[PDB]
Amino acid sequence: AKLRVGIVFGGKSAEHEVSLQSAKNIVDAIDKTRFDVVLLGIDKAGQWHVNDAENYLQNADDPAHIALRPSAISLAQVPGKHQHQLINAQNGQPLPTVDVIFPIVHGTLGEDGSLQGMLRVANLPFVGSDVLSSAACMDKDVAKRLLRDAGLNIAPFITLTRTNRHAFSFAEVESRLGLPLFVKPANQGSSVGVSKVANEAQYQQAVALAFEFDHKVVVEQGIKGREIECAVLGNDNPQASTCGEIVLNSEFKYIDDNGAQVVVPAQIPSEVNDKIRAIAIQAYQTLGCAGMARVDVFLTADNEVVINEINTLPGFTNISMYPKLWQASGLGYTDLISRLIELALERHTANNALKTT
Amino acid sequence: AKLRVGIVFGGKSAEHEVSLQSAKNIVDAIDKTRFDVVLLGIDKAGQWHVNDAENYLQNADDPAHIALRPSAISLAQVPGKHQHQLINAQNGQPLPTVDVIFPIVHGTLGEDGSLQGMLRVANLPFVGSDVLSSAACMDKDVAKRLLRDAGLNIAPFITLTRTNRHAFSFAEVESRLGLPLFVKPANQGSSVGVSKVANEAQYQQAVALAFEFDHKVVVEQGIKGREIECAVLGNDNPQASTCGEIVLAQVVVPAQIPSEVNDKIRAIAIQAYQTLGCAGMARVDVFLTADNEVVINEINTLPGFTNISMYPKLWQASGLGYTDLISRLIELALERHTANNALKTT
Ligand SMILES: Nc1ncnc2c1ncn2[C@@H]1O[C@H](COP(=O)(O)OP(=O)(O)O)[C@@H](O)[C@H]1O
Ligand SMILES: Nc1ncnc2c1ncn2[C@@H]1O[C@H](COP(=O)(O)OP(=O)(O)O)[C@@H](O)[C@H]1O
Ligand SMILES: [Mg+2]
Ligand SMILES: [Mg+2]
């Protein structure tokens, strides 16, 4: 009568350590009365394990050194099964059935649709956005094209590929987008490969760097404003939390938000707050998100709202923006976790009922 | 020692039998001197198996009744491993490692990014388009919005969700899009759940029907023109085959059109291919209007692959034989895997 909730955390990605911290806080917050938790830790090599709750983290208190305890047992997943989809990879021994997955592996694989495809194949219900949406929110070029097509405000930009890379002189790009410019790989996290550009030397350097991480590089016009974030929750009826502010400076990744200044709620007028909330929901809908997402925007001096990013699996530590925003909007961590689980099971039921032939 | 090619086929999809046929044809033609095939058949319940090439199909010679021979071994995948990713799901025994996967599961799961996601995590090189592109080409709504954003022509359309489906009345849709209309689930294959609509009754029926297959429904203006198809092959510098036509049941190859039109459609196929980030292959289907306007109807990332299907026929009629097409697709998968592996993570 209690649902087994498999929390999937860690991962190959550079956000591994932040993922450990999100997981730790969910394990602590989650309502024991309704849910038994199973710890599904992914090591830095990308292999899955079942961890013991008492000793699964080493140096849990210290972000720089925190690590996932090594485990004897590796997991495999069995396509098309509806029970016991997760097994011991060494000997085929089945784990007890997991009723729902809570993925909290930030960035690569976890946030880009790959994990979601795997879970879809294993008929595992899961929290958060599905394959198309996660893949699309992770490719900044694709997400911006969809946002643009929906009539929503985004930074003016161009996308460089391996084959159109040199068709653009730095002069051409400056005449298109003015200065400064930000240059970034299309698929990335946590500001890596991201550079501010004020001249031609910087631009050329910036592009070669970003092309080390992706086959597509986004170059976009610099936007002046406050960075405001908003937490969206739901499937068919998305609800927007109050907004929060993040302050990033130019002076300087195992800490969520890279240890930047975070204030909740954003010290902005409620009318602007509501305008950003409504826009965050349109963004959510345009990108086909499910379960939750965090929408990050720029607020200019004249209160124009420019969408910067949509994150489908945001930091979920006890002090991360996404949970804090809901806590400030009347929804506590525990109830948030439960709401996300409930939404995941409803969406699973909806998908399951669809005809195949 | 030859590259082991894992052919993934069948699947829990309406197009199951088609897939079975596509794989039979691939197995039959693949260059046995370069490649060892391993047959990764997926039954209709969606469970994977290893099949034997000498006896894996029942009624193989009969287009209806053709089915996958039941197998003892079911299969599991081990995330994170770079070798022996596929194991006996009962006892953990690994299969010898497969060097490349040729997915040919049409439609749901196989063609919509799910399978690709699984393969990406398993570090298995694979033929055809990757996670986002496969997912985006499968969702007609997303594919159309991307094509429109690129400045390419699509059928004017509205997209219905469970929350808005009752907002638009037949009369309002009609003023917007004219008649007749085509109503389609956003994510489906080969005309499943697709209806032509000429009046209100048909409309409500069609819409209710599409909503049994997907949570999004596309309603489009009917386009008047010839149905032309074009095969696209490659990654970074894709080539377009000559065009083929579908006639009132009859497949005509090459399509009887002026060379300028052939080349105009070809260049548009390629733009659509790039816009949607397709890799390895796709078939682009268009309407060619009476005034030579080209309207993109769809992009198939895993098109039917029988030696008689359109995609392989367009290549044959362009000078590229079926065995050789298969080999080039495998090479392309490997080239892309290697290029992806050279991207830095830090
Ligand atoms: N167009 C822009 N205008 C102003 N600042 C930008 C722009 N693009 C990026 N930045 C700055 O760089 C930071 C990281 O960029 P972002 O696109 O969010 O990449 P990531 O996905 O790595 O977080 C932003 O939070 C913002 O401060
Ligand atoms: N908008 C349209 N205008 C004219 N004919 C259409 C339109 N949409 C579909 N058709 C006809 O219906 C057929 C099936 O529709 P299609 O979208 O190709 O289904 P699927 O994508 O599942 O193959 C098309 O090949 C074409 O003959
Ligand atoms: Mg960001
Ligand atoms: Mg078609």
Side-chain angles (χ1 to χ4, degrees):
Chain A
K2 298 210 279 200
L3 298 178
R4 281 170 52 93
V5 177
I7 298 158
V8 167
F9 62 101
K12 283 175 79 167
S13 103
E15 286 114 86
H16 177 96
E17 281 75 18
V18 170
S19 191
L20 302 186
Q21 294 157 66
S22 296
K24 179 183 166 187
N25 299 139
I26 292 162
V27 164
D28 262 85
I30 195 168
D31 173 352
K32 293 326 170 129
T33 82
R34 290 167 70 171
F35 308 111
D36 288 326
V37 346
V38 30
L39 294 165
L40 266 12
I42 310 174
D43 61 34
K44 281 159 170 282
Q47 291 176 51
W48 291 41
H49 310 281
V50 195
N51 294 261
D52 274 312
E54 315 125 54
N55 61 99
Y56 71 106
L57 299 182
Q58 300 161 340
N59 320 156
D61 57 1
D62 173 23
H65 302 53
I66 194 186
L68 177 63
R69 294 270 281 145
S71 194
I73 117 287
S74 284
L75 303 181
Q77 68 107 339
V78 186
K81 288 253 170 183
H82 294 269
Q83 291 179 340
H84 295 113
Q85 305 95 315
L86 295 181
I87 63 185
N88 192 317
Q90 201 178 312
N91 52 46
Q93 163 128 122
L95 270 61
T97 298
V98 172
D99 303 308
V100 56
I101 294 290
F102 193 139
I104 203 55
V105 170
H106 311 121
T108 62
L109 290 189
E111 244 181 318
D112 63 25
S114 304
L115 174 63
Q116 291 72 22
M118 198 181 324
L119 298 174
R120 225 155 96 175
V121 177
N123 302 301
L124 283 160
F126 61 87
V127 160
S129 299
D130 210 292
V131 180
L132 178 41
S133 186
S134 306
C137 293
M138 178 74 10
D139 184 321
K140 273 180 200 61
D141 160 68
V142 169
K144 281 155 82 66
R145 280 193 273 148
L146 290 178
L147 292 170
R148 180 168 70 193
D149 173 84
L152 299 168
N153 289 129
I154 53 138
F157 79 102
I158 77 194
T159 296
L160 300 182
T161 69
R162 286 288 156 57
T163 68
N164 89 168
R165 192 224 236 257
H166 289 112
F168 298 91
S169 60
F170 166 83
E172 198 99 53
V173 171
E174 183 201 358
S175 81
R176 283 248 214 285
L177 306 175
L179 284 151
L181 293 166
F182 291 77
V183 164
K184 52 191 99 151
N187 296 84
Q188 256 309 130
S190 106
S191 259
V192 8
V194 170
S195 308
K196 190 163 186 184
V197 168
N199 58 63
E200 185 156 16
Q202 286 181 348
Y203 179 83
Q204 219 57 62
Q205 189 154 289
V207 170
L209 175 61
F211 262 119
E212 283 175 19
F213 303 107
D214 206 350
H215 296 128
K216 292 159 53 170
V217 170
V218 169
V219 186
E220 41 177 74
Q221 174 180 115
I223 306 305
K224 298 174 197 172
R226 301 168 73 180
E227 297 207 39
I228 308 300
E229 298 184 341
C230 173
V232 181
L233 175 63
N235 291 328
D236 300 323
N237 205 2
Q239 302 301 125
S241 71
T242 190
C243 297
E245 178 166 11
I246 188 170
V247 183
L248 289 169
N249 72 39
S250 63
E251 286 188 272
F252 298 100
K253 31 92 165 299
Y254 46 90
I255 291 129
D256 200 25
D257 289 316
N258 304 112
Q261 175 181 349
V262 163
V263 184
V264 175
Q267 300 305 106
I268 62 175
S270 58
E271 214 159 34
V272 178
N273 192 47
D274 288 335
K275 178 186 180 170
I276 292 173
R277 300 173 56 241
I279 283 185
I281 290 177
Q282 301 178 293
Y284 193 87
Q285 288 165 332
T286 298
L287 266 292
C289 302
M292 54 166 173
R294 196 184 77 214
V295 181
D296 311 340
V297 307
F298 302 121
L299 180 67
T300 68
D302 6 80
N303 289 323
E304 283 304 289
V305 177
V306 182
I307 290 151
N308 178 38
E309 198 158 344
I310 303 187
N311 302 270
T312 60
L313 294 176
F316 220 85
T317 77
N318 61 0
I319 62 165
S320 294
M321 180 74 89
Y322 188 98
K324 278 303 193 193
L325 286 175
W326 277 115
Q327 181 170 258
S329 301
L331 191 71
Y333 295 10
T334 302
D335 295 352
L336 173 57
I337 291 166
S338 296
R339 195 40 183 167
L340 283 160
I341 283 154
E342 292 171 6
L343 295 166
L345 299 156
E346 295 185 336
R347 196 169 75 80
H348 190 73
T349 302
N351 291 349
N352 230 268
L354 295 173
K355 274 184 181 163
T356 282
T357 317
Chain B
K2 310 171 175 175
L3 274 197
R4 278 165 57 81
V5 180
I7 301 182
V8 181
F9 66 104
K12 183 188 203 283
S13 170
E15 304 152 290
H16 177 98
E17 287 67 22
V18 191
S19 180
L20 290 186
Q21 277 162 276
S22 295
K24 192 177 172 296
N25 287 257
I26 298 166
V27 173
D28 291 342
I30 191 163
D31 173 9
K32 300 303 180 304
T33 74
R34 280 171 86 163
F35 310 114
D36 288 345
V37 320
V38 10
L39 298 176
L40 299 174
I42 303 184
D43 59 31
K44 286 187 146 174
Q47 288 189 45
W48 292 36
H49 310 278
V50 206
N51 289 85
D52 176 10
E54 285 156 347
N55 190 32
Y56 65 106
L57 290 172
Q58 305 187 303
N59 313 326
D61 327 275
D62 184 344
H65 297 148
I66 181 181
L68 184 69
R69 176 159 280 96
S71 183
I73 300 185
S74 61
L75 295 183
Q77 153 209 191
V78 189
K81 282 180 82 190
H82 298 267
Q83 53 176 66
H84 303 281
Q85 304 95 314
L86 298 175
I87 62 175
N88 188 319
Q90 202 105 232
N91 62 36
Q93 290 173 23
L95 269 45
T97 121
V98 169
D99 300 291
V100 61
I101 289 293
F102 197 133
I104 199 59
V105 169
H106 313 108
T108 310
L109 296 180
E111 188 161 19
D112 65 13
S114 296
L115 173 52
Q116 291 72 19
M118 238 199 66
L119 298 180
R120 180 190 301 183
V121 171
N123 301 119
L124 287 164
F126 65 88
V127 167
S129 294
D130 209 299
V131 174
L132 175 50
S133 184
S134 297
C137 289
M138 263 296 324
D139 181 320
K140 280 146 175 168
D141 165 69
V142 169
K144 291 157 70 76
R145 286 190 267 149
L146 289 175
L147 296 169
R148 173 172 73 189
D149 174 77
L152 302 162
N153 305 317
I154 55 152
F157 75 108
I158 273 161
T159 147
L160 304 187
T161 73
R162 326 218 66 129
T163 68
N164 71 23
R165 80 181 276 185
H166 299 107
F168 318 79
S169 60
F170 172 79
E172 194 218 333
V173 172
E174 184 207 297
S175 53
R176 267 220 233 175
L177 304 175
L179 296 175
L181 296 168
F182 292 73
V183 169
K184 325 179 177 172
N187 287 270
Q188 255 313 322
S190 38
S191 88
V192 174
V194 171
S195 307
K196 184 158 181 190
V197 173
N199 55 64
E200 191 189 21
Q202 291 173 345
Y203 183 65
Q204 287 163 325
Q205 298 296 331
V207 167
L209 172 72
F211 268 114
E212 290 179 315
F213 296 91
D214 197 7
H215 303 123
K216 280 160 59 177
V217 174
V218 174
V219 180
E220 337 186 299
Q221 167 188 304
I223 303 296
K224 299 173 188 192
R226 301 164 71 183
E227 310 190 11
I228 309 288
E229 305 198 342
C230 181
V232 178
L233 173 73
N235 293 327
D236 256 354
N237 304 286
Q239 301 196 57
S241 70
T242 190
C243 296
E245 183 170 3
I246 285 165
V247 177
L248 298 154
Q250 244 61 75
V251 167
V252 188
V253 183
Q256 255 99 259
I257 51 186
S259 71
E260 271 194 6
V261 178
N262 200 222
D263 292 347
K264 183 187 182 166
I265 294 171
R266 291 166 70 236
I268 295 182
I270 285 171
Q271 289 183 280
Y273 195 85
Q274 308 176 302
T275 299
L276 276 138
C278 299
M281 64 166 161
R283 193 190 77 221
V284 177
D285 312 336
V286 310
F287 297 108
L288 170 66
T289 58
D291 67 327
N292 288 336
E293 287 315 315
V294 176
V295 185
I296 299 163
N297 179 41
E298 79 181 8
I299 297 165
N300 258 254
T301 63
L302 257 22
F305 224 79
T306 79
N307 57 28
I308 238 190
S309 302
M310 182 76 82
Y311 183 95
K313 284 171 98 76
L314 292 170
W315 278 119
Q316 279 156 40
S318 309
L320 180 71
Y322 189 52
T323 293
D324 291 330
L325 169 57
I326 289 167
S327 301
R328 184 64 183 145
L329 284 157
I330 293 161
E331 312 190 337
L332 283 159
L334 290 172
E335 290 170 19
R336 195 168 66 80
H337 190 77
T338 296
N340 287 351
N341 281 354
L343 297 178
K344 257 144 293 186
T345 174
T346 52

